[PDB]
Design a protein around this motif. Structure first.
Motif, PDB file in Angstrom:
ATOM      1  N   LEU E  88       0.865  -1.076  -0.090  1.00 44.30           N
ATOM      2  CA  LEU E  88       0.068  -0.035   0.076  1.00 44.30           C
ATOM      3  C   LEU E  88       1.027   1.257  -0.010  1.00 44.30           C
ATOM      4  N   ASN E  89       0.657   2.150  -0.847  1.00 48.23           N
ATOM      5  CA  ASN E  89       1.199   3.525  -0.798  1.00 48.23           C
ATOM      6  C   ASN E  89       0.365   4.568  -0.085  1.00 48.23           C
ATOM      7  N   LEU E  90       0.648   4.769   1.235  1.00 45.18           N
ATOM      8  CA  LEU E  90      -0.129   5.532   1.785  1.00 45.18           C
ATOM      9  C   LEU E  90       0.515   6.548   2.372  1.00 45.18           C
ATOM     10  N   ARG E  91      -0.402   7.771   2.650  1.00 43.56           N
ATOM     11  CA  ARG E  91       0.162   9.299   3.042  1.00 43.56           C
ATOM     12  C   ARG E  91       0.522   8.916   4.598  1.00 43.56           C
ATOM     13  N   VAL E  92       1.395   9.806   4.924  1.00 43.99           N
ATOM     14  CA  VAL E  92       1.806  10.052   6.271  1.00 43.99           C
ATOM     15  C   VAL E  92       0.705  10.275   7.258  1.00 43.99           C
ATOM     16  N   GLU E  93      -0.357  10.769   6.683  1.00 41.39           N
ATOM     17  CA  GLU E  93      -1.499  11.239   7.611  1.00 41.39           C
ATOM     18  C   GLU E  93      -2.394   9.888   8.088  1.00 41.39           C
ATOM     19  N   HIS E  94      -2.345   8.809   7.452  1.00 38.06           N
ATOM     20  CA  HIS E  94      -3.053   7.593   7.621  1.00 38.06           C
ATOM     21  C   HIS E  94      -2.090   6.491   8.437  1.00 38.06           C
ATOM     22  N   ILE E  95      -0.835   6.986   8.768  1.00 36.88           N
ATOM     23  CA  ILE E  95      -0.029   6.027   9.188  1.00 36.88           C
ATOM     24  C   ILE E  95       0.509   6.535  10.717  1.00 36.88           C
ATOM     25  N   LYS E  96       0.676   5.421  11.528  1.00 34.85           N
ATOM     26  CA  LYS E  96       1.129   5.739  12.975  1.00 34.85           C
ATOM     27  C   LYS E  96       2.404   4.674  13.219  1.00 34.85           C
ATOM     28  N   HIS E  97       3.494   5.012  13.895  1.00 33.45           N
ATOM     29  CA  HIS E  97       4.371   4.304  14.610  1.00 33.45           C
ATOM     30  C   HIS E  97       3.803   3.462  15.596  1.00 33.45           C
ATOM     31  N   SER E  98       4.109   2.022  15.369  1.00 37.01           N
ATOM     32  CA  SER E  98       3.371   0.948  16.343  1.00 37.01           C
ATOM     33  C   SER E  98       4.197   0.679  17.535  1.00 37.01           C
ATOM     34  N   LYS E  99       3.350   0.672  18.674  1.00 31.13           N
ATOM     35  CA  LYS E  99       3.941   0.343  19.836  1.00 31.13           C
ATOM     36  C   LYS E  99       3.974  -1.557  20.072  1.00 31.13           C
ATOM     37  N   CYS E 100       3.645  -1.952  19.259  1.00 29.69           N
ATOM     38  CA  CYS E 100       3.431  -3.714  19.063  1.00 29.69           C
ATOM     39  C   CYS E 100       4.754  -4.179  19.428  1.00 29.69           C
ATOM     40  N   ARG E 101       5.818  -3.476  19.581  1.00 25.01           N
ATOM     41  CA  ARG E 101       7.247  -4.204  19.713  1.00 25.01           C
ATOM     42  C   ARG E 101       7.694  -3.375  21.142  1.00 25.01           C
ATOM     43  N   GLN E 102       7.280  -2.243  21.336  1.00 22.96           N
ATOM     44  CA  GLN E 102       7.945  -1.431  22.634  1.00 22.96           C
ATOM     45  C   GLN E 102       7.897  -2.394  23.729  1.00 22.96           C
ATOM     46  N   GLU E 103       7.277  -3.100  24.166  1.00 25.60           N
ATOM     47  CA  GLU E 103       7.429  -4.178  25.329  1.00 25.60           C
ATOM     48  C   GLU E 103       8.653  -4.955  24.988  1.00 25.60           C
ATOM     49  N   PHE E 104       8.576  -5.630  23.870  1.00 30.38           N
ATOM     50  CA  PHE E 104       9.955  -6.467  23.397  1.00 30.38           C
ATOM     51  C   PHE E 104      11.386  -5.633  23.566  1.00 30.38           C
ATOM     52  N   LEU E 105      11.331  -4.635  22.936  1.00 33.04           N
ATOM     53  CA  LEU E 105      12.648  -3.767  23.030  1.00 33.04           C
ATOM     54  C   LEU E 105      12.851  -3.337  24.632  1.00 33.04           C
ATOM     55  N   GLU E 106      12.042  -2.940  25.193  1.00 32.95           N
ATOM     56  CA  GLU E 106      12.372  -2.489  26.600  1.00 32.95           C
ATOM     57  C   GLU E 106      12.731  -3.832  27.423  1.00 32.95           C
ATOM     58  N   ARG E 107      12.258  -4.868  27.073  1.00 35.41           N
ATOM     59  CA  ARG E 107      12.628  -6.110  27.685  1.00 35.41           C
ATOM     60  C   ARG E 107      13.697  -6.944  27.077  1.00 35.41           C
TER      61      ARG E 107
END
Ligand SMILES: [Mg+2]
Ligand SMILES: [Mg+2]
Ligand SMILES: [Mg+2]
Ligand SMILES: [Mg+2]
Ligand SMILES: [Mg+2]
Ligand SMILES: [Mg+2]
Ligand SMILES: [Mg+2]
Ligand SMILES: [Mg+2]
Ligand SMILES: [Mg+2]
Ligand SMILES: [Mg+2]
Ligand SMILES: [Mg+2]
Ligand SMILES: [Mg+2]
Ligand SMILES: [Mg+2]
Ligand SMILES: [Mg+2]
Ligand SMILES: [Mg+2]
Ligand SMILES: [Mg+2]
Ligand SMILES: [Mg+2]
Ligand SMILES: [Mg+2]
Ligand SMILES: [Mg+2]
Ligand SMILES: [Mg+2]
Ligand SMILES: [Mg+2]
Ligand SMILES: [Mg+2]
Ligand SMILES: [Mg+2]
Ligand SMILES: [Mg+2]
Ligand SMILES: [Mg+2]
Ligand SMILES: [Mg+2]
Ligand SMILES: [Mg+2]
Ligand SMILES: [Mg+2]
Ligand SMILES: [Mg+2]
Ligand SMILES: [Mg+2]
Ligand SMILES: [Mg+2]
Ligand SMILES: [Mg+2]
Ligand SMILES: [Mg+2]
Ligand SMILES: [Mg+2]
Ligand SMILES: [Mg+2]
Ligand SMILES: [Mg+2]
Ligand SMILES: [Mg+2]
Ligand SMILES: [Mg+2]
Ligand SMILES: [Mg+2]
Ligand SMILES: [Mg+2]
Ligand SMILES: [Mg+2]
Ligand SMILES: [Mg+2]
Ligand SMILES: [Mg+2]
Lengths: 169, 211, 122, 296, 159
Positions: E88-107
């Motif tokens: 998908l070619n999406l504009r920045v307005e419809h995108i969000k950095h994910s915190k789905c890995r934040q737990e992992f990285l912090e751990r």
RNA sequence: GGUUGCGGCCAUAUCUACCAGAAAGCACCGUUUCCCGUCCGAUCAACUGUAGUUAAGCUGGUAAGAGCCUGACCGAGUAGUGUAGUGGGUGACCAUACGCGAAACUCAGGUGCUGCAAUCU
RNA sequence: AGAACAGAAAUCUCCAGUAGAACAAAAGGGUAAAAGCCCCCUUGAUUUUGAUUUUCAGUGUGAAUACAAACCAUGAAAGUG
RNA sequence: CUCAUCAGACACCACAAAAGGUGUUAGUUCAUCUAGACAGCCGGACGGUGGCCAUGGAAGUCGGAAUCCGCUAAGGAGUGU
RNA sequence: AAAUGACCUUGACCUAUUCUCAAACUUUAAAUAUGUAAGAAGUCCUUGUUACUUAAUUGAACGUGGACAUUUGAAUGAAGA
């Protein structure tokens, strides 16, 4: 407590509602122009009634905005006509006021029967200093209650000047 | 021409009101919902008796009207025009359809045919308010109106004062000390919230901290 | 795993086994998965041969690692073939089985009453 | 507040407030988006704005980059710094704008290191030109002109600040058709006129247009210009010599310590009223219920 | 007949987060995106250009391309009995950095931390997450806590 | 701490009514030769910083204020719901078992926080 | 709330106004220094071939998206097309 | 618990409703009663007083407002003739 | 006599209340279902390449050298994938 809460006149706008277009209108306009010295502005009809015999965008009125000393001048030139007597009506609760005069030759200007006679609405809108907040581009703001024009405050200002009288009730 | 109400006793469909879209609807057979001394004051009638549904069913506007007149009639003819306030607490906003019988069941979405109210279990249908001197009478009235309806309903005596959400003791407490303010059918109450000046013009009798 | 047992409450019966129930389960129906070919246990040399790395080298070593849920419970337990029990011998004590234990049925967590039932099925 | 006008609970519950800096009529976000946002494959390289604003007769010239947590000023230059370089009166004239322009041009060029290189145009004949990039060496610093809510008229002083940053050396892409002396109909520019406005020529010509047909408003307007014995013939060199002063030292030193900050904190927290206690206004209304309902 | 247009059925999906309408704040144009970032996909009804088709709402993917106004996101869509790769070619307005890995990285940073602190003293590592264990014994006191005996309550009506 | 320019989050920031505001800063404010725009130098352009004012802007505070934000065994383990039975009932519907679990209500608390640069008794 | 003829409806003024309007059309989204209204300048409704999304067989067609390579329009400009 | 001069007898399933019963069973809210209540025979309901307007004529009684003492175990300014 | 006149009257509008509703209404907002992640294709450091990109060996992408092993990063299962 007025150190400068000192009620100038903002503008005076004169208005002949020439209820159709063409020669009568291009005549009421030159009337406005040898009373204003400014080029007046024509008003087109908003919608179409056909009782009043008009059509949308028909150029059926003319007015002109005059500010400052010239407008005190033509104000007085019309309060003469109306004998410095007004009404407790005729005043916006928002502070301005106006009157009307048929027979526009009572203002000075001579008769010239190749223009006819015309009536005129006079509206005087009034304001203290620093009305600029409301009308500037940057930081457009609203003036405090204490500082804007009142009806009572402006009839008092009007009676105090011109030694004029306003009304019953 | 009206179909027997057994054809629409149950809530088989999702609410089909009058609306931008349905919009050829016939008129509800019940139009007046408050009867008797509807202008009376909350003090005038402390007793309250409900007719309450025990079924999740549908009540025709026709039978709503029929039982309104039934109960209001008995009540006045034994109690008097201004002895009671009878409020029907159920408005029939649900439109019943019908498929009008050289074609078959092709394309067979009905036209509006009637109205009906959709009542839960424990939903008040009738509410009547009097003073306790009357209770037997309004009770018998609702009992006679019961017979105009499909499905078990039961009469129950409110613990509340007339049409208020307050029980009789709590209401007494409120008004005796400081806080009730009559109004045409109904009553207003003193808030501790909001403007304090505008709270005092209203309810002056209070703030003696006394009766 | 508790959420698993919740997911399957109406098809199983389960509870808290006593030492006696576990001992008699391993002794009588205890089979190891050894290069499957499930194998009756029948000598401690088998246990040692496959649970030896983990320090289990007897049948009671096995039982003990089960009952005291061990540091090596996963391997000790995955080593035991699922026990093949017969029907209860006394019967089920209820007229219908597929109701919760609490409702006079058989499924769900009866808690020490698992032992009466398993002992009647072992 | 006419009774016919007051706003309902519902009105206010369902009202959506705009952005603070929009309520404050201070930020055109539709413009800010397009000034600030960078090409996404340029990832952290920031877009630098040359904001210039006008206080009521004082000129601000910041160079900012933006940041999810808040715009950061790289250089700042205020036109009230012009005393230092040899201007005294009217620091809102077109040439004060040009001055501040040049000042921040060279202040940042030196803060960076392209001070010696990209010295800009010095012999300011008022030509149209942009500070061109130098063969085999760093491209100039590039900023875009943040005029804010200023209304872009041809011949206005925002473009004077523009012209002066440009002439100082910054690369500020710009056309010419809103420089004083751009011809309305025929698409060309008068550089003798633009040099004039760069220097004073319209203010000097106002001075010697009023010194011999109105001594009676020349009296008061231009007061300081007499109180320091300097007339029209003058200015062009006041400004040329300021130009010299700035290109020679841009270095921004600030104002002297002068009751360092904790002192101001104190002598203004003297005028900063702090809120009342919940128990305070509890009693401040129990007072009122005694005093008013209490039958006096 | 039936209607199956591109934005069919998105009435509420693309609606505007009531009392959050209007121009989009600039932090979402100030976020930066690199190839391989995990991003979420939520359409912004106010930016009609470059928006995702409804199927990819609520869906998370990986950046594969970075262009001037938009990012390319890789999504795994399940067609039949198999997943296919969609880009998908999406504009920045419809995108969000994910915190789905934040737990992992912090751990992982926490893990290496207590692993260093582990081999500092004698090695007692203990750094895998474990599910909620059941509760352990405890002694409950009745000091100022004698038990109030409750019974069920009879039928009232209340109405 | 005040203030300004540019800001992030975008009402704990909005709305209504009052009152207070030193210093500096903003401001309103004076002028129309010049560039520039208007029916109107009101807006917009330019010039002065001179002649004038805290009246308004702006900042702050007050209100059993409206709105808004937050919290709670407040309501409520309620409504709804996943799962089970050869459970009840003519039916409508209903109770029970292993789990998940609101919204309204009510009460309490709060009314912008903060980044960069410059400036200030 | 205010102004000669002027009336429910003509034109003029101020105050309030979260959109209660308008944006060809059906409806639903969306939009307030705009996406609406007035004005100014224009032809990007252009050139070259690829990739991508929906429908899907992951064929075609319709429609759409984000780039590459041109040549242009507009604006002080960032930009936007 | 139920006795049916068409009893009832097991999910899906091979149907029955509103409404009624002084059959019988258990229960709910009011009441009376060993200071004698309910039922049934027996006595007493007199009197201060024909308290008053309708007056062709009402002690309570065609009828209309009304509302109490003395004696008493009790006795209506009046439920029915 | 009229009044831009007082007054009743019924109306619609405004204010705070009141009974009841929505598949094509809604601030709020579940349960069940649903996307991604839980390492060696990991994490971290040192500093080459380029024509892209930056004011800039700035960044971007792809690399050389170096440091940390199965508690190598949850559970359960696997007649293997
Ligand atoms: Mg003053
Ligand atoms: Mg006519
Ligand atoms: Mg159903
Ligand atoms: Mg149906
Ligand atoms: Mg038919
Ligand atoms: Mg046929
Ligand atoms: Mg058809
Ligand atoms: Mg049809
Ligand atoms: Mg409902
Ligand atoms: Mg019934
Ligand atoms: Mg209520
Ligand atoms: Mg046997
Ligand atoms: Mg036996
Ligand atoms: Mg059986
Ligand atoms: Mg056996
Ligand atoms: Mg309200
Ligand atoms: Mg703009
Ligand atoms: Mg359809
Ligand atoms: Mg908005
Ligand atoms: Mg488009
Ligand atoms: Mg001052
Ligand atoms: Mg200006
Ligand atoms: Mg003040
Ligand atoms: Mg301000
Ligand atoms: Mg404030
Ligand atoms: Mg409040
Ligand atoms: Mg359920
Ligand atoms: Mg069932
Ligand atoms: Mg539309
Ligand atoms: Mg075309
Ligand atoms: Mg299809
Ligand atoms: Mg294929
Ligand atoms: Mg084909
Ligand atoms: Mg194609
Ligand atoms: Mg029979
Ligand atoms: Mg059944
Ligand atoms: Mg029955
Ligand atoms: Mg007697
Ligand atoms: Mg809904
Ligand atoms: Mg899942
Ligand atoms: Mg695993
Ligand atoms: Mg395994
Ligand atoms: Mg294998």
């Amino acid at each position: 407590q007025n150190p400068m809460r000192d009620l100038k006149i903002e503008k005076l706008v004169l208005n002949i509602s020439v209820g159709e277009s063409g020669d009568r209108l291009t005549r009421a306009s030159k009337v406005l122009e040898q009373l204003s010295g400014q080029t007046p502005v024509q008003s087109k009809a908003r919608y179409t009634v056909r009782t009043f015999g008009i059509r949308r965008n028909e150029k059926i009125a003319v007015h002109v905005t005059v500010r400052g000393p010239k407008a005190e001048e033509i104000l007085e030139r019309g309060l003469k006509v109306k004998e410095y007597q007004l009404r407790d009506r005729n005043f916006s609760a928002t502070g301005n006021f106006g009157f009307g005069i048929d027979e526009h030759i009572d203002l000075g200007i001579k008769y010239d029967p190749s223009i006819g006679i015309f009536g005129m609405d006079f509206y005087v809108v009034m304001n203290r200093p620093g009305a600029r907040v409301t009308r500037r581009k940057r930081c457009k703001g609203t003036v405090g209650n204490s500082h804007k024009t009142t009806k009572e405050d402006t009839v008092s200002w009007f009676k105090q000047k011109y030694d004029a009288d306003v009304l019953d009730k | 021409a009206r179909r027997p109400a057994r054809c629409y006793r149950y809530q088989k469909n999702k609410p089909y009101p009058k609306s931008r879209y349905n919009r050829a609807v016939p008129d509800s057979k019940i139009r007046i919902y408050d009867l008797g001394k509807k202008k009376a004051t909350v003090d005038e009638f402390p007793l309250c008796v409900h007719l309450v549904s025990n079924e999740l069913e549908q009540l025709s506007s026709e039978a709503l009207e029929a039982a309104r007149i039934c109960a209001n009639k008995y009540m006045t003819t034994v109690s008097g025009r201004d002895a009671f306030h009878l409020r029907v607490r159920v408005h029939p906003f649900h439109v019943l359809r019908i498929n009008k019988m050289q074609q078959g069941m092709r394309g067979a979405w009905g036209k509006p045919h009637g109205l009906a109210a959709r009542v839960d279990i424990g939903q008040i249908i009738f509410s009547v308010r009097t003073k306790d001197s009357n209770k037997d009478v309004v009770v018998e009235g609702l009992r006679r109106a019961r017979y105009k309806f499909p499905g078990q309903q039961k009469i129950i005596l409110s613990k509340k004062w007339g049409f208020t959400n307050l029980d009789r003791p709590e209401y007494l407490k409120k008004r005796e000390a400081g806080e009730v303010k009559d109004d045409g059918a109904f009553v207003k109450f003193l808030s501790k919230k909001g403007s304090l000046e505008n709270n005092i013009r209203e309810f002056p009798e209070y703030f003696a901290a006394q009766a | 795993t508790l959420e698993l047992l919740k997911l399957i409450e109406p098809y199983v019966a389960y509870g808290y086994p006593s030492y006696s129930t576990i001992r008699q389960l391993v002794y009588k129906r205890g089979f190891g998965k050894i290069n499957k070919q499930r194998v009756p246990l029948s000598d401690n040399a088998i246990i040692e041969a496959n649970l030896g790395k983990y320090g289990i080298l007897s049948i009671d070593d096995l039982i003990h690692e089960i009952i005291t849920v061990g540091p090596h419970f996963k391997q000790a337990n995955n080593f035991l073939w699922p026990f093949k029990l017969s029907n209860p011998s006394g019967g089920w004590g209820v007229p219908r089985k597929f109701k919760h234990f609490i409702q006079g049925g058989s499924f769900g967590n009866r808690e020490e009453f698992i032992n009466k039932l398993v002992k009647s099925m072992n | 507040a006419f009774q016919k006008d007051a706003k309902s609970s519902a009105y206010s519950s369902r009202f959506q407030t705009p952005f603070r800096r929009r309520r404050e009529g201070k930020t055109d976000y539709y413009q800010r988006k397009r000034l600030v946002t960078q090409h996404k494959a340029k990832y952290n390289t920031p877009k630098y704005r040359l904001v210039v604003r006008f206080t009521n007769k004082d000129i601000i010239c910041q160079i900012i980059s933006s940041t999810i947590t808040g715009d950061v000023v790289l250089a700042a230059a205020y036109s009230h710094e012009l005393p230092r370089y040899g201007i005294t009166h009217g620091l809102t004239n077109w040439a004060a704008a040009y001055a501040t322009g040049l000042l921040i041009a060279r202040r940042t060029l030196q803060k960076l290191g392209l001070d010696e290189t990209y010295k800009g145009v010095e012999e300011v004949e008022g030509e149209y030109e942009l500070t061109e990039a130098v063969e085999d060496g760093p491209r100039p610093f590039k900023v875009f002109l943040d005029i804010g809510l200023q209304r872009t008229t041809t011949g206005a002083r925002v473009f004077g600040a523009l012209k002066g940053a440009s002439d100082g050396g910054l690369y500020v892409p710009h056309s010419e058709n809103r420089f004083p002396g751009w011809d309305f109909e025929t698409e060309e520019i008068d550089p003798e006129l633009l040099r004039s406005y760069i220097f004073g020529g319209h203010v000097s010509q106002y001075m010697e247009e009023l010194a011999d047909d109105d001594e009676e408003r020349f009296s008061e307007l231009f007061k300081g210009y007499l109180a320091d014995d300097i007339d029209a013939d003058s200015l062009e060199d006041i400004y040329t010599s300021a130009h010299e002063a700035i290109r020679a030292d841009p270095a921004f030193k600030p104002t002297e310590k002068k009751f360092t900050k904790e002192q101001y904190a104190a002598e203004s927290k003297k005028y900063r009223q702090t809120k009342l206690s919940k128990e305070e206004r509890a009693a401040r209304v129990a007072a009122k219920i005694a005093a008013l309902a209490g039958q006096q | 007949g039936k209607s199956h247009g591109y934005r069919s059925r998105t009435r509420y999906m693309f609606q505007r987060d009531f009392r959050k309408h209007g121009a989009v704040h600039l932090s979402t144009y100030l976020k930066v995106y690199k190839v391989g970032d995990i991003v979420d996909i939520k359409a912004n009804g106010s930016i009609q250009k470059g928006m995702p088709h409804k199927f990819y709402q609520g869906k998370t993917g990986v950046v594969y391309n970075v262009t001037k106004s938009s990012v390319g996101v890789i999504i795994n869509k399940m067609v039949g009995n198999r997943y296919l790769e969609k880009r998908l070619n999406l504009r920045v307005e419809h995108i969000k950095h994910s915190k789905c890995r934040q737990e992992f990285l912090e751990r992982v940073k926490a893990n290496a931390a207590k692993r260093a602190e582990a081999k500092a003293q004698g090695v007692a590592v203990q750094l895998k997450r474990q599910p909620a264990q059941p509760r352990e014994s405890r002694i409950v006191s009745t000091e100022g806590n004698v038990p109030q005996t409750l019974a069920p309550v009879p039928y009232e009506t209340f109405i």
